[PDB]
Each structure stands twice: as C-alpha cells, then as structure tokens.
C-alpha cells in the first residue's frame, strides 16, 4: 500500500520520523495548499492513504475535508486512529507535531494503517 507523509515547516521533522518508521511495511513517499496537493494525489490514485503533520493538525484537517471526496481525521490517540478507518473510512489522518510526541505519533500511524488496509 502507498502512503504519502507530508509536513509543513512545523511538522516536517515528525513527518520524516513517521516516514522512516513506516518505510519497511508500506511504500512511503515523504512529500514535504499542502492538503490540496496531497488530497488531489489521493483522489487520482497516486497514494492509497496520507498522513499530514502540522502544528496542531487542525488546519490541514479542515483544508483536506474541503476537498470533495476526501475524508480526513485528526487522530491524537490510537483508539481514534482505528475508528478513523473502521467508522469514518478516512483516507487521510492528521496530527500536530506541537501537540503529541513522536512515539505516540508512530503508534497512531500504525493503528490507522493496520485497520484501513
């Protein structure tokens, strides 16, 4: 499965951490308007799922959900990450690098991707 991981200036560092953590189990593209570019690539099949990382995750979640056909979930715990897939069928999850820590972030990415696939 193809997973895009992207971060703005605030979230680029955690995005790289997440990309490296996922690279052995998924085909990861670390591709750090951002929500628009990544959402369009999910819609046209370039990626199956995406993880967008900013300061809080709020702005990218709003912007991604404004793309028709995109469902984006801000996920800051592993239960919500699983529900984002099983209940909301989100293609995109978002996180805030200034809000949660890197080890929790990795468990959230893993929990979402294990359920959506």
> Which is nearer to a copy of itself, 32 or 35 (by Cβ)?
35
DSSP per-residue codes, the chain:
-EEEEEE-TTTHHHHHHHHHHHTTTSEEEE---HHHHHHHHHHTTS-SEEEEEESSSHHHHHHHHTSTT--EEE--SHHHHHHHHHTT--SEEEEETTTS-HHHHHHHHHHHHHHH-
Q: What minimum distance in Å lies between the beta carbon of 112 and a copy of itself?
A: 11
β-strand pairing of 2-7 with 49-54: parallel
**Catalytic residue from among 54, 70, 81, 108:** 54
Q: Is 54 a catalytic residue?
A: yes
Q: What are the residues binding a copy of itself (CB under 8 A)?
A: 55-59, 61-62, 65-66, 71-77, 79-80, 83-84, 87-88, 90, 96, 98-99
Pick the closer one to a copy of itself by CB: 19 or 84: 84
Would you say 85 and 71 are in contact if contact means Cβ atoms under 8 Å apart? no
Nearer to a copy of itself by C-beta: 3 or 93? 93
In the complex, the smallest distance separating the C-beta of residue 24 from a copy of itself, rounded to whole angstroms, is: 28
Q: Least Å distance between CB 23 and a copy of itself?
A: 26
Q: Show which residues are catalytic.
A: 54
């Amino acid at each position: 499965m193809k997973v895009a991981v992207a971060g703005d200036s605030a979230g680029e560092g955690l995005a790289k951490v997440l990309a490296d953590h996922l690279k052995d189990r998924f085909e990861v593209s670390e591709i750090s308007n951002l929500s628009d570019r990544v959402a369009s690539a999910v819609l046209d099949g370039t990626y199956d799922r995406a993880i967008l990382v900013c300061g809080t995750g709020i702005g990218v979640c709003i912007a991604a959900n404004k793309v028709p056909g995109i469902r984006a979930a801000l996920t800051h715990d592993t239960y919500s990450a699983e529900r984002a897939a099983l209940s909301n069928n989100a293609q995109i999850i978002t996180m805030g690098a200034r809000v949660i820590g890197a080890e929790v972030a990795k468990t959230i990415a893993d929990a979402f991707l294990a359920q959506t696939f």
